[PDB]
């Protein structure tokens, strides 16, 4: 497990951890092909606008994948795009091309959100390998 976070307590009072969590049960295969059973959570206690207690904003992605030794593989994803227009106008007067804008009220909003989680297992067999991984860091 790995969790860099905060334990916010939340009514039910239980104390739930809410951070970058990453809980891998990495299980190395023949052909240096690591087979990870991963639970990966970025989460981020926000307000509780409406709700009783605090609403955690959680992007968890728990799966099992099988990765090469040393190549990255993409666990997860989300490519949201939104686009809300709105225009209240004084009906027909808000039609005129030049002066329309005097009577119209336009409201446009475009939200685009790209969340990819990549994962890269590296196998450390030989100590010398660890020295590097570690040292470099």
């Amino acid at each position: 497990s790995f969790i860099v976070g905060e334990e916010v307590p939340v009514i039910t009072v239980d104390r739930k951890e809410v951070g970058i969590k990453l809980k891998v049960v990495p299980q190395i295969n023949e052909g240096d092909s690591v087979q990870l059973n991963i639970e990966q959570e970025v989460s981020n206690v926000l307000g509780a606008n409406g709700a009783v207690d605090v609403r955690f904003a959680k992007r968890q992605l728990n799966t099992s994948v099988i990765v090469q030794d040393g190549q990255m593989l993409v666990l997860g994803g989300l490519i949201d795009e939104r686009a809300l227009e709105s225009e209240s106008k004084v009906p027909l007067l808000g039609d005129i091309p030049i002066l329309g804008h005097l009577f119209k009220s336009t409201n446009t909003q475009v939200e685009k959100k790209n969340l990819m989680v990549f994962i890269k297992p590296t196998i450390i067999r030989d100590g010398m390998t660890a020295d590097g991984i570690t040292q470099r860091k």
């Binding site: 795009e81 686009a83 227009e85 225009e87 336009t106 446009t108 475009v110 685009k112």
Partner: peptide
Amino acid sequence: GLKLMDDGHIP
């Protein structure tokens, strides 16, 4: 297009 934005942002 998206009325006041650049026409490119519309999914």
